[PDB]
Symmetry: C2
Subunit: 52 residues, 2 copies
Amino acid sequence: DGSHQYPYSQHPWDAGTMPELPYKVWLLENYGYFQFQGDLIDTSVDGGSPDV
Amino acid sequence: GSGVGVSTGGWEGGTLFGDNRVITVNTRQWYAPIYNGHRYTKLEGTGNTFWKGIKTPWGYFNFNAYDSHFSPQDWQRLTNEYRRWRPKKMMVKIYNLQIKQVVTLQGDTLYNNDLTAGVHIFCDGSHQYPYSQHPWDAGTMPELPYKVWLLENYGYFQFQGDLIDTSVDGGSPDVENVEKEIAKSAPFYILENANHEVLRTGEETNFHFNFDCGWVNNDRAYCPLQADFNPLVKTRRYFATRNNYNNSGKFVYTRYSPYNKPSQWMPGPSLGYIGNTQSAATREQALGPVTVVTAPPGTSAYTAFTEQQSKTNQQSASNATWSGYDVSPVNCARSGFDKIGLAYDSAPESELEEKISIRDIDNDMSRWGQVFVQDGTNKEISNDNTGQGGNTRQNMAELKNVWMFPNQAWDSTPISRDFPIWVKSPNTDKHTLFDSSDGTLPMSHPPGTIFVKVAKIPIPTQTNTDSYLTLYVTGQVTCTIEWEVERFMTKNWRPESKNDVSSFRDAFLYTVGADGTYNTPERFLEGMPTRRGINKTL
């Protein structure tokens, strides 16, 4: 993704970078991304009727 | 060259009859006042009607009638000499503009000419603004070239009063309330969004338009659709007859008479509903053969209940007249009901006498009086073999309501001199066959409506409230339409019926009286209808 059209969830200071030892095998990291904030969806979100 | 003191044009008029083309030039003297005080205001019908819309500070040229374009003789010579006609291209020219100011210096009112006052003129060719012009409106171009023509105030439908009614309170948004949504999604149009010209006394403008439309047929069929055949030859077809009136029976076949032959040509569509005549005193309720209540699924129109079969809101037939809009005439190809649907007056703004004219005379035999359907034997079949007949049965019945069906052929209504020329075809996705029971020619894009308002000149006020200068515009408009015509040709030996005046009941007609009152026809024949004598081999 060169345009960064998908969430860039990579953080500095993550343990999944390229190994420093060239002879160690490198297991790629599972990708995932933030979506919503648990306590900002919390109150009165019941789907009984739309609340605009 | 140009300026305040040279005229932009001159009076053009007359007509040119030709083999392939007729060109009718007409000029009128018009004036537009200040409409509604230079403001858009919500238009609500008094009485019981749910029609609601906008009243606009604008006025418009309505060129749609025949009698405005043709004189009585130009019409007569048109209908007598030509088989069919349609418009090709129209050209309107608005010129010799004059803007006058109305000032009251004393008890008297004096009219003095204010130069440097503009007039807004806007032709909507794309129909981006609501086309609210209706055929059968009293605001068309005058038939008398010497009468001055007051343009009509423009306004348009916005929302339906009983479809905004229920629970529309603005306390909180209701997104599931559908009537709340109709009011939200109803449009509001302003003609100041559009590019348009502002003219002064020295300036002029003109507009061209190219019609794409069907024809207007002036010839009649002398023969019923089903009556055209040769009795001298015997037909090859037989008709079935049940014999013994029981289960053991079978059809026995015998040849048609040479004088009675079956046909493949059905009667054109019709609806046998004559409209409501109950002596109802309310003019704004729907009195018409077919009244149509438009309500979206979730809406409740006027007083509505839920049909428990479908669980949908429906209305009683009495309440529907409140909520609905009639369509007339629906008779279409039935000429028996010609007298029902159309009744109209020629005389505009005349409180003297009604002079209501109704279309009585149609001699065209391609339009049918009645249709009868006969479904079998006159006596119910006995369930046993042998036995004699059974309970009596209704063999024949009148078909009142004839819908569209394959192999239908008919002719449109004969039109009088004073009818509308065209009608706006809706911008809907789907359309069926175009046949108008008022004879109009529906067009996708008819001539664009020309709007006129008078430029607003403010008056400074201490209170800062809106105060405008009182002034109006008068001018001259020349409408020139080019008509595509077809001269008839026939091998008929006998003379045709030509719309002579000798058949008129009133001797003094189409002429002014002692006080200047122009005498107009109160009857449909005196309006010189089409489809009179010219015979059309079926």
